[PDB]
Amino acid sequence: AIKLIVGLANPGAEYAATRHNAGAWYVDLLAERLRAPLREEPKFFGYTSRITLEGEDVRLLVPTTFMNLSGKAVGAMASFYRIQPDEILVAHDELDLPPGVAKFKLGGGHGGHNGLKDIISKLGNNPNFHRLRVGIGHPVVGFVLGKPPVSEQKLIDEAIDEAARCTELWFKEGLAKATSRLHTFKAQ
């Protein structure tokens, strides 16, 4: 079972609407659907909560470390609760998929994403955790710290809603079934 779901971001009103916060947008939507609002917990250097998906603890995290220091929060929380890397799901913005599309992945490279790079480092040079890749398209620093136009934002919002519904499906019926639904979303 997945025990910890992380949404990557930078802190403050300044960055709230920028592309590099797409992972946090997904964790915030999930927390609302499951009636478990996030609150500040300085022990783990971020906002946190706890939900249930029939019928075990799932913990939620959005770091306030700044993006390139994300591993500090993920490392501290996983070590405290004795959670293994294959029990972690990390949601992040993905340049190599278009707005409107999202995918699940286990392991692999960081794809240039310096939040992922810091988590791989702080888990012990270990990339073997799960990811939700939320498509934002290609442009880069100005791009990932920029705000999408309205047309692109609507498509990202569509993909995040489908990904939340497919995360609930993963807990009910398995990763294979959840993957079949999510990956065929725009391939129809």
Side-chain angles (χ1 to χ4, degrees), residues 1-31 33-34 36-38 40-53 55 57-188:
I2 296 294
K3 294 182 194 271
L4 178 62
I5 304 181
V6 185
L8 300 188
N10 284 299
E14 180 178 3
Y15 291 113
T18 63
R19 288 180 179 97
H20 233 22
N21 274 35
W25 299 343
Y26 157 85
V27 168
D28 285 334
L29 173 64
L30 199 52
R33 280 178 69 87
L34 303 170
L38 303 162
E40 189 176 350
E41 188 162 24
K43 178 180 185 75
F44 302 125
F45 314 103
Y47 284 68
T48 65
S49 189
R50 182 170 57 67
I51 54 174
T52 307
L53 292 173
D57 287 349
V58 185
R59 298 182 187 277
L60 305 184
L61 170 64
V62 174
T64 55
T65 52
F66 284 79
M67 184 62 86
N68 296 4
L69 302 169
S70 289
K72 181 179 168 65
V74 178
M77 198 163 178
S79 288
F80 186 82
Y81 294 112
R82 295 104 190 250
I83 294 168
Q84 294 301 302
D86 80 327
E87 294 167 337
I88 306 174
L89 173 67
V90 181
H92 64 91
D93 51 303
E94 175 60 79
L95 294 164
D96 288 338
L97 297 168
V101 177
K103 298 183 68 172
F104 295 125
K105 182 174 180 176
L106 175 62
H110 56 57
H113 198 295
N114 284 324
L116 292 179
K117 181 178 163 85
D118 198 59
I119 293 166
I120 296 165
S121 170
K122 298 303 182 286
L123 292 176
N125 196 33
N126 191 338
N128 300 296
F129 54 90
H130 294 89
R131 306 95 183 271
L132 175 68
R133 304 165 68 208
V134 181
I136 58 162
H138 288 284
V140 175
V141 60
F143 184 77
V144 301
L145 300 181
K147 175 175 158 188
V150 178
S151 58
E152 289 177 27
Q153 187 69 46
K154 281 182 67 57
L155 286 164
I156 296 163
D157 288 346
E158 277 175 41
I160 283 175
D161 200 341
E162 181 69 2
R165 292 167 205 284
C166 290
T167 301
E168 293 192 48
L169 184 60
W170 180 348
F171 279 86
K172 193 179 179 66
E173 308 189 13
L175 180 54
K177 286 230 217 301
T179 297
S180 179
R181 177 174 165 175
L182 181 59
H183 292 199
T184 63
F185 186 50
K186 293 293 193 189
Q188 278 297 36

